[PDB]
PDB file of C-alpha atoms and ligand atoms in Angstrom:
ATOM      1  CA  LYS A   1      -1.711  31.749   9.518  1.00 31.69           C
ATOM      2  CA  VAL A   2      -0.814  28.570   7.669  1.00 29.07           C
ATOM      3  CA  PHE A   3      -3.429  25.923   8.411  1.00 28.41           C
ATOM      4  CA  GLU A   4      -2.661  22.266   8.745  1.00 29.21           C
ATOM      5  CA  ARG A   5      -4.725  20.119   6.378  1.00 29.55           C
ATOM      6  CA  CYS A   6      -7.181  18.454   8.769  1.00 31.60           C
ATOM      7  CA  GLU A   7      -7.507  21.590  10.940  1.00 32.02           C
ATOM      8  CA  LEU A   8      -8.632  23.471   7.826  1.00 35.59           C
ATOM      9  CA  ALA A   9     -11.058  20.728   6.774  1.00 32.54           C
ATOM     10  CA  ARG A  10     -12.903  20.847  10.101  1.00 31.39           C
ATOM     11  CA  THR A  11     -12.812  24.661  10.117  1.00 30.57           C
ATOM     12  CA  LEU A  12     -14.461  24.771   6.676  1.00 29.54           C
ATOM     13  CA  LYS A  13     -17.033  22.148   7.701  1.00 27.68           C
ATOM     14  CA  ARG A  14     -18.117  24.157  10.747  1.00 26.94           C
ATOM     15  CA  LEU A  15     -18.462  27.218   8.471  1.00 30.32           C
ATOM     16  CA  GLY A  16     -20.963  25.410   6.237  1.00 32.10           C
ATOM     17  CA  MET A  17     -18.782  24.690   3.199  1.00 31.00           C
ATOM     18  CA  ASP A  18     -19.470  20.950   2.800  1.00 30.94           C
ATOM     19  CA  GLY A  19     -21.804  20.676  -0.175  1.00 34.40           C
ATOM     20  CA  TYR A  20     -22.313  24.432  -0.491  1.00 36.79           C
ATOM     21  CA  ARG A  21     -23.921  24.895  -3.925  1.00 33.70           C
ATOM     22  CA  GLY A  22     -22.997  21.274  -4.669  1.00 31.99           C
ATOM     23  CA  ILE A  23     -19.268  21.641  -3.839  1.00 35.85           C
ATOM     24  CA  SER A  24     -17.776  18.930  -1.616  1.00 37.74           C
ATOM     25  CA  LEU A  25     -15.357  19.745   1.189  1.00 39.17           C
ATOM     26  CA  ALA A  26     -12.562  17.939  -0.675  1.00 39.73           C
ATOM     27  CA  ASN A  27     -12.967  20.359  -3.589  1.00 36.02           C
ATOM     28  CA  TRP A  28     -12.694  23.394  -1.296  1.00 36.79           C
ATOM     29  CA  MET A  29      -9.587  21.828   0.259  1.00 38.76           C
ATOM     30  CA  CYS A  30      -8.029  21.200  -3.151  1.00 36.16           C
ATOM     31  CA  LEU A  31      -8.747  24.835  -4.060  1.00 35.67           C
ATOM     32  CA  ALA A  32      -7.124  26.213  -0.899  1.00 33.89           C
ATOM     33  CA  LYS A  33      -4.108  23.923  -1.289  1.00 33.14           C
ATOM     34  CA  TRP A  34      -3.298  25.028  -4.825  1.00 35.08           C
ATOM     35  CA  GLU A  35      -4.254  28.705  -4.445  1.00 32.88           C
ATOM     36  CA  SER A  36      -2.328  29.460  -1.252  1.00 31.31           C
ATOM     37  CA  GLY A  37      -0.888  26.374   0.437  1.00 30.36           C
ATOM     38  CA  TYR A  38      -3.501  26.943   3.166  1.00 28.80           C
ATOM     39  CA  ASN A  39      -1.997  30.377   3.947  1.00 27.57           C
ATOM     40  CA  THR A  40      -4.396  33.172   4.924  1.00 26.79           C
ATOM     41  CA  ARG A  41      -1.715  35.882   4.358  1.00 23.35           C
ATOM     42  CA  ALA A  42      -1.019  34.848   0.747  1.00 22.69           C
ATOM     43  CA  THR A  43      -1.048  37.658  -1.808  1.00 24.68           C
ATOM     44  CA  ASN A  44      -0.286  37.717  -5.517  1.00 25.45           C
ATOM     45  CA  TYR A  45      -0.078  40.928  -7.517  1.00 24.83           C
ATOM     46  CA  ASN A  46      -1.100  40.602 -11.164  1.00 24.97           C
ATOM     47  CA  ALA A  47       1.034  43.197 -12.923  1.00 26.89           C
ATOM     48  CA  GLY A  48      -0.819  42.567 -16.179  1.00 28.00           C
ATOM     49  CA  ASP A  49      -4.133  44.008 -14.997  1.00 29.58           C
ATOM     50  CA  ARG A  50      -3.254  45.768 -11.680  1.00 28.46           C
ATOM     51  CA  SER A  51      -5.420  43.482  -9.509  1.00 27.80           C
ATOM     52  CA  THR A  52      -4.349  41.439  -6.478  1.00 28.65           C
ATOM     53  CA  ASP A  53      -5.382  37.978  -5.227  1.00 30.52           C
ATOM     54  CA  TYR A  54      -5.926  37.809  -1.456  1.00 32.36           C
ATOM     55  CA  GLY A  55      -5.898  35.123   1.189  1.00 32.62           C
ATOM     56  CA  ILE A  56      -6.422  31.407   1.486  1.00 34.73           C
ATOM     57  CA  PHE A  57      -8.666  31.265  -1.608  1.00 38.54           C
ATOM     58  CA  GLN A  58      -6.731  33.945  -3.574  1.00 37.41           C
ATOM     59  CA  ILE A  59      -9.876  35.992  -4.214  1.00 34.93           C
ATOM     60  CA  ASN A  60      -9.351  38.746  -6.770  1.00 35.40           C
ATOM     61  CA  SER A  61      -9.799  42.482  -6.175  1.00 32.29           C
ATOM     62  CA  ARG A  62     -11.216  43.276  -9.640  1.00 31.85           C
ATOM     63  CA  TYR A  63     -14.622  41.828  -8.755  1.00 31.52           C
ATOM     64  CA  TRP A  64     -14.857  40.590  -5.174  1.00 28.17           C
ATOM     65  CA  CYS A  65     -13.259  42.901  -2.574  1.00 30.79           C
ATOM     66  CA  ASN A  66     -12.177  46.534  -2.386  1.00 28.44           C
ATOM     67  CA  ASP A  67      -8.516  47.509  -2.049  1.00 27.95           C
ATOM     68  CA  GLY A  68      -8.814  51.030  -3.521  1.00 25.11           C
ATOM     69  CA  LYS A  69      -5.955  50.453  -5.997  1.00 27.59           C
ATOM     70  CA  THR A  70      -7.582  48.272  -8.686  1.00 28.83           C
ATOM     71  CA  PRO A  71      -8.887  50.437 -11.546  1.00 24.21           C
ATOM     72  CA  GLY A  72     -12.557  50.117 -12.395  1.00 23.72           C
ATOM     73  CA  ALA A  73     -12.946  47.338  -9.841  1.00 24.19           C
ATOM     74  CA  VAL A  74     -16.119  46.349  -8.025  1.00 26.04           C
ATOM     75  CA  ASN A  75     -16.633  44.796  -4.599  1.00 25.43           C
ATOM     76  CA  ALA A  76     -19.223  42.018  -4.840  1.00 26.56           C
ATOM     77  CA  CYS A  77     -18.449  40.605  -1.383  1.00 26.61           C
ATOM     78  CA  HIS A  78     -18.785  44.107   0.150  1.00 27.41           C
ATOM     79  CA  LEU A  79     -15.544  43.673   2.114  1.00 27.81           C
ATOM     80  CA  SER A  80     -12.200  45.379   2.374  1.00 24.42           C
ATOM     81  CA  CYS A  81      -9.618  43.056   0.858  1.00 22.51           C
ATOM     82  CA  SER A  82      -7.975  43.279   4.311  1.00 20.54           C
ATOM     83  CA  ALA A  83     -10.774  41.039   5.611  1.00 18.36           C
ATOM     84  CA  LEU A  84      -9.383  38.289   3.366  1.00 19.87           C
ATOM     85  CA  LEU A  85      -5.992  38.403   5.164  1.00 21.30           C
ATOM     86  CA  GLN A  86      -7.296  37.534   8.649  1.00 24.05           C
ATOM     87  CA  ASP A  87      -6.306  34.387  10.534  1.00 22.34           C
ATOM     88  CA  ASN A  88     -10.024  33.756  11.074  1.00 18.96           C
ATOM     89  CA  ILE A  89     -11.457  32.683   7.717  1.00 18.18           C
ATOM     90  CA  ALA A  90     -15.168  33.388   8.310  1.00 18.68           C
ATOM     91  CA  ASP A  91     -15.195  36.441   6.020  1.00 17.85           C
ATOM     92  CA  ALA A  92     -13.149  34.658   3.347  1.00 18.26           C
ATOM     93  CA  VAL A  93     -15.624  31.768   3.471  1.00 18.92           C
ATOM     94  CA  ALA A  94     -18.616  34.104   3.128  1.00 22.80           C
ATOM     95  CA  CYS A  95     -16.916  35.662   0.094  1.00 21.36           C
ATOM     96  CA  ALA A  96     -16.043  32.288  -1.489  1.00 23.57           C
ATOM     97  CA  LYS A  97     -19.711  31.323  -1.122  1.00 23.38           C
ATOM     98  CA  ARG A  98     -20.650  34.522  -2.975  1.00 25.40           C
ATOM     99  CA  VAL A  99     -18.168  33.709  -5.762  1.00 25.59           C
ATOM    100  CA  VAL A 100     -19.760  30.301  -6.382  1.00 29.51           C
ATOM    101  CA  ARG A 101     -23.298  31.678  -6.458  1.00 27.50           C
ATOM    102  CA  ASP A 102     -22.276  33.028  -9.867  1.00 25.27           C
ATOM    103  CA  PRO A 103     -22.791  30.848 -12.982  1.00 25.11           C
ATOM    104  CA  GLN A 104     -19.343  29.236 -13.104  1.00 21.99           C
ATOM    105  CA  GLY A 105     -19.498  27.956  -9.533  1.00 21.91           C
ATOM    106  CA  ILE A 106     -16.210  26.401  -8.414  1.00 23.76           C
ATOM    107  CA  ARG A 107     -14.911  26.834 -11.994  1.00 23.68           C
ATOM    108  CA  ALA A 108     -14.456  30.544 -11.211  1.00 26.36           C
ATOM    109  CA  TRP A 109     -10.877  29.706 -10.137  1.00 23.61           C
ATOM    110  CA  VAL A 110      -8.670  28.494 -12.994  1.00 21.84           C
ATOM    111  CA  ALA A 111      -6.458  26.673 -10.486  1.00 22.16           C
ATOM    112  CA  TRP A 112      -9.431  24.472  -9.599  1.00 23.70           C
ATOM    113  CA  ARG A 113      -9.891  23.570 -13.275  1.00 25.17           C
ATOM    114  CA  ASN A 114      -6.144  22.866 -13.597  1.00 26.17           C
ATOM    115  CA  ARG A 115      -5.493  20.976 -10.346  1.00 26.86           C
ATOM    116  CA  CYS A 116      -8.833  19.658  -9.047  1.00 26.02           C
ATOM    117  CA  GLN A 117     -11.450  19.168 -11.790  1.00 26.28           C
ATOM    118  CA  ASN A 118     -11.912  15.530 -12.863  1.00 27.24           C
ATOM    119  CA  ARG A 119      -9.308  14.374 -10.339  1.00 28.22           C
ATOM    120  CA  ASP A 120      -9.269  12.063  -7.329  1.00 29.11           C
ATOM    121  CA  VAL A 121      -9.525  14.616  -4.481  1.00 27.70           C
ATOM    122  CA  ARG A 122     -10.114  12.134  -1.623  1.00 23.79           C
ATOM    123  CA  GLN A 123      -6.611  12.653  -0.216  1.00 23.03           C
ATOM    124  CA  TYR A 124      -7.378  16.193   0.903  1.00 22.42           C
ATOM    125  CA  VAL A 125      -9.938  15.088   3.534  1.00 24.73           C
ATOM    126  CA  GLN A 126      -8.657  11.610   4.460  1.00 26.63           C
ATOM    127  CA  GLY A 127      -8.376  11.083   8.216  1.00 27.67           C
ATOM    128  CA  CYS A 128      -9.762  14.503   9.152  1.00 28.64           C
ATOM    129  CA  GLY A 129     -13.099  13.465  10.673  1.00 29.99           C
ATOM    130  CA  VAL A 130     -15.236  15.281   8.108  1.00 31.52           C
TER     131      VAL A 130
HETATM  132 CL1  LIG B 201     -24.323  29.008   4.395  1.00 30.38          CL
HETATM  133 CL1  LIG B 202     -15.651  15.717   0.846  1.00 32.07          CL
HETATM  134 CL1  LIG B 203     -16.280  49.548  -2.372  1.00 31.88          CL
HETATM  135 CL1  LIG B 204     -13.440  48.813   1.681  1.00 32.66          CL
HETATM  136 CL1  LIG B 205     -17.084  18.878 -11.999  1.00 31.38          CL
HETATM  137 CL1  LIG B 206     -11.835  10.333   9.488  1.00 31.56          CL
HETATM  138 NA1  LIG B 207     -18.695  44.803   4.484  1.00 35.47          NA
HETATM  139 NA1  LIG B 208     -23.304  28.277 -10.858  1.00 33.14          NA
END
């Protein structure tokens, strides 16, 4: 599914994302916007290294989920990458939380550094009741 902005903001808030490891809801929203356009079915194959990015947060198969086809990959979220293509985002949120428990935090996603870091991100949550 493709979420609408404020729908997604409240969904993430109910799933415990606001302030998770210091990361505001607006930052999670900015991440989802630029990774996938709020689309849980989004996929991107990286021909350069044979990995794939899955779901609303575009979480990568080399480290975080198992798809069976990424060489030498691990599965730190202990999930099939299929779980990251569901309309319900609970599993994707649990995995994103795992990602940011690592040293880099939200910086794990280059798109966040490019599109969200040191920016005014208020617009992503304005009017949503969060
Ligand atoms: Cl939690
Ligand atoms: Cl916020
Ligand atoms: Cl595995
Ligand atoms: Cl699996
Ligand atoms: Cl920062
Ligand atoms: Cl509001
Ligand atoms: Na599992
Ligand atoms: Na960290």
